[PDB]
Design a protein around this ligand. Structure first.
Ligand SMILES: *[C@@H]1O[C@H](CO[C@@H]2O[C@@H](C)[C@@H](O)[C@@H](O)[C@@H]2O)[C@@H](O[C@@H]2O[C@H](CO)[C@@H](O[C@@H]3O[C@H](CO[C@H]4O[C@H](CO)[C@@H](O)[C@H](O)[C@@H]4O[C@@H]4O[C@H](CO)[C@@H](O)[C@H](O)[C@H]4NC(C)=O)[C@@H](O)[C@H](O[C@H]4O[C@H](CO)[C@@H](O)[C@H](O)[C@@H]4O)[C@@H]3O)[C@H](O)[C@H]2NC(C)=O)[C@H](O)[C@H]1NC(C)=O
Ligand SMILES: *[C@@H]1O[C@H](CO)[C@@H](O[C@@H]2O[C@H](CO)[C@@H](O[C@@H]3O[C@H](CO[C@H]4O[C@H](CO)[C@@H](O)[C@H](O)[C@@H]4O[C@@H]4O[C@H](CO)[C@@H](O)[C@H](O)[C@H]4NC(C)=O)[C@@H](O)[C@H](O[C@H]4O[C@H](CO)[C@@H](O)[C@H](O)[C@@H]4O)[C@@H]3O)[C@H](O)[C@H]2NC(C)=O)[C@H](O)[C@H]1NC(C)=O
Lengths: 207, 206
């Protein structure tokens, strides 16, 4: 029978008013015998109908994949409203419902600390700049690097890790040519999180 | 019908001869109606019989594990371990295979980073251990001080870096008073590409 997957908006979308956060209800494994699928959307149990269903797309394994997108208000998501996607299909014993919401719990402000490279790493051609983000809740967060206004692309960020006190932490590693760090260039770690002022903070790092 | 999941040994078990590494074959959704389950194990296609099936836990939803000890060097050399599960309530037996990640093992680079000077206005400080450039991702990280283990630490999962190697960070949290006194803390890393599968990097107030 069919399967349903419900995806939340990206952390960055809910935190910046310029962007459009969306919850996405994906239905896979819809057979040819019964291709009609209907979506009912609910916000805290109140049915809404402003969703946008996309017309079914046959996949290469002879099954139809139907996607429905519901735009959400930034403050609705941040205020913790529940979003329920009810999927009905005549080849189902009963409709399938999935619910998604922001993690429950008191939000906490990320602490952002930039750490320079260990002196051991200076014998390398490239050095690792570290951004420690700890003590934040919920785990939805975005981390970026930049220098002199332009983005740095050669960086990787760990997934959020549950800390011992119930908050989350992560590390972000920016890799630059050792020549740039030695010159004295300034690098900045950008963090977006709901518990930040303007949902944004910036911590710089230089020799 | 039932499903089968096959798990590798713990990184630490394969790297220390004193420990016993094991691959674990978990069968879930075994019904009351048909409870009989069987296991056949193979090492690179050669059937072995030293496996040991351990019984047996009924679940919170009305719904069997088999363990096979392996030689440390067999796993590290990349031999295949096959768990064939037979059940009369299956259309045909389910077989799953697992092995160590393939590729040239690479040596972890281990760097200890002191706390940011901003963090000293806190009751506790964060000691950081960067482990990068290692392959495969199987690894164990521990912290200690004066020979004894530190327990209040967390380690990120391995993250695939841009060059195909992995990195992680480990964060040890200590009372700011211990760091200020000058105590020495050590980040221990176990990995197959290290000499003696082990390296240690210290960190203290400078
Ligand atoms: C018929 O074919 C379908 C699609 O076929 C395609 O063609 C084949 C040849 C392959 O190339 C496929 O890769 C390709 O898609 C199959 O569909 C899939 O079904 C499976 C279920 O069996 C679905 O798995 C679920 O995936 C979730 C994650 O999905 C995101 O990421 C996927 C990449 O990893 C991506 O492919 C998806 O499209 C989806 O992308 C996100 O989409 C949303 C909205 O569109 C965006 O907002 C996000 O930004 C996207 N993210 C990214 C990173 O791009 C998993 O989370 C999920 O797991 C969860 O549930 C299980 C329980 O079911 C838990 O155990 C688990 O812990 C977790 O909680 C699950 O794995 C898969 O997504 C489907 N593919 C698509 C494209 O929808 C059919 O299975 C197949 N039918 C048969 C009978 O073979
Ligand atoms: C009734 O309730 C049961 C729970 O009590 C349900 O059992 C569950 O069944 C699902 C399958 O439907 C299993 O899901 C898989 O989990 C694998 C990971 O398993 C390990 O980690 C989980 C913690 O997340 C842990 O609960 C498991 O017990 C298992 O632990 C590992 O165990 C080994 C040896 O015992 C140990 O050495 C490891 O250290 C240990 N690891 C950890 C972290 O503890 C995933 O790998 C599976 O995913 C794969 O397959 C996906 C496709 O299906 C694919 O997309 C993925 O990428 C991946 O390849 C899968 O998610 C649950 O583990 C299992 N729970 C338990 C407790 O056994 C039962 O299904 C349910 N039945 C009904 C009818 O309701």
């Amino acid at each position: 029978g069919p399967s349903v997957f419900l995806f939340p908006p990206k952390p960055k979308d809910t935190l910046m008013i310029s962007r459009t956060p969306e919850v996405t209800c994906v239905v896979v494994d819809v057979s040819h015998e019964d291709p009609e699928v209907k979506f009912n959307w609910y916000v805290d149990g109140v049915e809404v109908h402003n969703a946008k269903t996309k017309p079914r797309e046959e996949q290469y394994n002879s099954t139809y994949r139907v996607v429905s997108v519901l735009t959400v208000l930034h403050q609705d998501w941040l205020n913790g409203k529940e979003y329920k996607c009810a999927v009905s299909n005549k080849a189902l014993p009963a409709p399938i419902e999935k619910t998604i919401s922001k993690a429950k719990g008191q939000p906490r402000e990320p602490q952002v600390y930039t750490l320079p490279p260990s002196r051991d790493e200076l014998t390398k051609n490239q050095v690792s700049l570290t951004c420690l983000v700890k003590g934040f809740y919920p785990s939805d967060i975005a981390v970026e690097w930049e220098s002199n206004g332009q983005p740095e692309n050669n960086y990787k960020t760990t997934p959020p890790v549950l800390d011992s006190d119930g908050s989350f932490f992560l590390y972000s590693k920016l890799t630059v040519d050792k020549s740039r760090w030695q010159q004295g260039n300034v690098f900045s770690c950008s963090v977006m999180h709901e518990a930040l002022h303007n949902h944004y903070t910036q911590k710089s790092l230089s020799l």
